[PDB]
Structure 1
Amino acid sequence: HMEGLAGYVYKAASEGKVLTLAALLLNRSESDIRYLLGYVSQQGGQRSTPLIIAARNGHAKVVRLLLEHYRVQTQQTGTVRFDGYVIDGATALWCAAGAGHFEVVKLLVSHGANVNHTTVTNSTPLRAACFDGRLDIVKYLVENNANISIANKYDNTCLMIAAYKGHTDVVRYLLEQRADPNAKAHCGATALHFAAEAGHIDIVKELIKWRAAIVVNGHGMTPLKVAAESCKADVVELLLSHADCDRRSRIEALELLGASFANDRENYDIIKTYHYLYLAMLERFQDGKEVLPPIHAYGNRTECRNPQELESIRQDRDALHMEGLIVRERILG
């Protein structure tokens, strides 16, 4: 078939048997060698070349040989599985970046690989490194002119995904490299929203430390409101020690957060419900409009209005729960 030996070459590459590879290649014509190494191979659904799976599997030895003696294109693209998913438009450098194989990444950059290559999703190898969180690669990739500002097909910046996958030190890095903190995603989010919802205290600090705009996302939710709906009390108290938000905004977050302690399934604390809801009851000579009891839901109940109204519920494990659901419906729908 001739293409059957192509599979043997792909095998040794994927398996890192650089011995097996070398002995397969030598004594063949350039016509032959360009083919064998150019063969796109669909092991299952994943279409890739010998160079790629080696970088995808961190096999430096075979990668070095392929890049030098046989002189293979670094721009070869394919479609590689990562945690079940098939990503498309990926080069060997995109694979080694996400796969955490530094030595291969260096090699691949050393032999003239596009550090700014975009996948079909428009994911730079720097993004893959940011998703994975291997700071050495990010450092190296950036120090070799990987553009930090190119983003996802949905404008998900390298900074966001790292703020999402809690890569605190990678985040501080991108920030030191003056990554734009107030870049906004399609859904309207900033890296603050991502970090707040994910409860990454350290990252929220660095984000605010770099003059993070408190922007409103596509849902119309500040990172404060998001972090309270995701029931991330720690974050919510941090952000609230930076005025910026009104008195209305400060209360809504408190109530929301308190509500999210009774609606949340994982974290659930009716004591922490009667705390953020009692705090919310603000006074002076001015106050703050409830809704009708639902056709049957929520036990046909009305939210508390007086601070005295609320106090009487400190001890009703049940009614407090119901109160939280009512509060959520008000500030959500």
Structure 2
Amino acid sequence: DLKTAVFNAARDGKLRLLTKLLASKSKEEVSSLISEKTNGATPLLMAARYGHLDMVEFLLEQCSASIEVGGSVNFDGETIEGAPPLWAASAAGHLKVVQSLLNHGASVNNTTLTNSTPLRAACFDGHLEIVKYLVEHKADLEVSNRHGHTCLMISCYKGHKEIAQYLLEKGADVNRKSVKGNTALHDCAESGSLDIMKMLLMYCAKMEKDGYGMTPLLSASVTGHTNIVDFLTHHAQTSKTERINALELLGATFVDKKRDLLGALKYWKKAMNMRYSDRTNIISKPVPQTLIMAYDYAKEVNSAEELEGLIADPDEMRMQALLIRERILGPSHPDTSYYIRYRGAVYADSGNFKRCINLWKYALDMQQSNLDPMTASSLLSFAELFTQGRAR
């Protein structure tokens, strides 16, 4: 009940109640209880996390021997494990604590248990001034978290243009891939950060497939960022067939995620026009192996006239969207079985329980047929409903 008095005076920065308390014991055992956990954290960790500069200066100007011990710390409503003081100060935006922790010899490389450096923490929340300071004090730009997600990737995802710009000026490698194949170009595509994406292309960032087989163009189509799709379908590094599929998949995203059938049809005619623009080389639609009961045995429209009838027929547009997504994403991408389940749920809600059950049977059999190099997260099952690479 004396340690808890020390930690509490720390998490709150009341140095009076601390200095007056800490004058009773001697050096030997003032050190021993500044160095102890209170629900996973140390007094120093909490001093830095809440920006209490003159108390971290005091604690260090005493015994500076827990400066690298990570513990537990609270951010955004959750608590992270193994976080050193420097990491907590950078994440929280306390530049002054950052400068003093370093001035007392803190290691700019010490990470949390996810291997998230102080530099990564300052990029996530947008603390450009702390980013410049950590880099100018020997931070390593290419140390990734354990998913292989870099500081540049997270800055793109979060839309921190100035920070991404700064890292690229300091020589960050624009073509790093995470373990799942994520590049910084995918983080721009999935956040809709068009102007950061252009800036990545000033450095000749290469468009590549990730583990799911998706380029940044297709990822924009999956996530619905029309500004990215519009830019990249007019970019020479995407071929004619990739453009068609990107537009067809985007329209399927308009049907199922945006619930906008007029928008969908506009992208589907754009694609259908490209398919038939050159009569010397028609790009006709692939042919699946069999008709699918869960899809009401439907077929993809293969000409512009079959697209004029689609306007009037909302259920046929819903089956086209399912057919397109299974063709382009395939059965092991999570969005495929997910949107098959969503479509079934809407039919349940409309009284069509046979259609509902047939689609749900089909989604389960699809997830089970593709059992085992990437992860099947139980986060999209029925019970759970009732990215970790991009964590801080």
User: Normalising to structure 1: TM-score of the pair?
Assistant: 0.92
Structure 1 position 87, deviation (Å)? 2.3
Query: Measured at CA, do residues 293 and 259 of structure 1 come closer, stay the same or move farther in structure 2, by a change above 3 Å?
Result: farther
Structure 1 position 70, deviation (Å)? 4.3
**Structure 2 counterparts to residues 309-324 of structure 1, below 5 A:** 309-324=306-321
**Corresponding residue to 1:164 among 157, 170, 177:** 157
SS in 1 for 2:71: strand
The aligned amino acid for 2:270 is L
Alignment match, 1:242: 235
CA distance in 1, matches of 2:261, 2:35: 62
Q: Percent identity?
A: 44
SS in 1 for 2:51: coil
CA distance in 1, matches of 2:306, 2:293: 22
The aligned amino acid for 2:282 is D
Unaligned runs of 5+ in 1: none
CA distance in 1, matches of 2:261, 2:169: 41
| Residue 12 of structure 1 pairs with residue 1 of structure 2 | no
Alignment match, 1:116: 109
Unaligned runs of 5+ in 2: 331-392
The aligned amino acid for 1:152 is N
- On the 8 A contact 1:228/1:257 being kept in 2, the answer is yes
Deviation sequence 1:169-214 (CA, Å, 0-9, x none) = 2211211111111100011110111221121222222222221110
Query: Measured at CA, do residues 62 and 55 of structure 1 come closer, stay the same or move farther in structure 2, by a change above 3 Å?
Result: same
- On the 8 A contact 1:12/1:18 being kept in 2, the answer is yes
| Residue 76 of structure 1 pairs with residue 69 of structure 2 | yes
CA distance in 1, matches of 2:288, 2:68: 60
- On the 8 A contact 1:298/1:326 being kept in 2, the answer is yes
Alignment match, 1:280: 271
Alignment match, 2:294: 297
| Residue 329 of structure 1 pairs with residue 321 of structure 2 | no
Structure 1 position 69, deviation (Å)? 4.1
**Structure 2 counterparts to residues 248-263 of structure 1, below 5 A:** 248-263=241-256
CA RMSD in angstroms, aligned pairs only: 1.7
**Structure 2 counterparts to residues 87-166 of structure 1, below 5 A:** 87-166=80-159
SS in 2 for 1:25: coil
CA distance in 2, matches of 1:131, 1:96: 13
- On the 8 A contact 1:51/1:92 being kept in 2, the answer is yes
Query: Is 165-174 or 245-254 further displaced after alignment?
Result: 165-174
Deviation sequence 1:211-256 (CA, Å, 0-9, x none) = 1110110011100011111111111111223211221111111111
Alignment match, 1:219: 212
CA distance in 2, matches of 1:133, 1:6: 35
- On the 8 A contact 1:293/1:302 being kept in 2, the answer is no
- On the 8 A contact 1:163/1:203 being kept in 2, the answer is yes
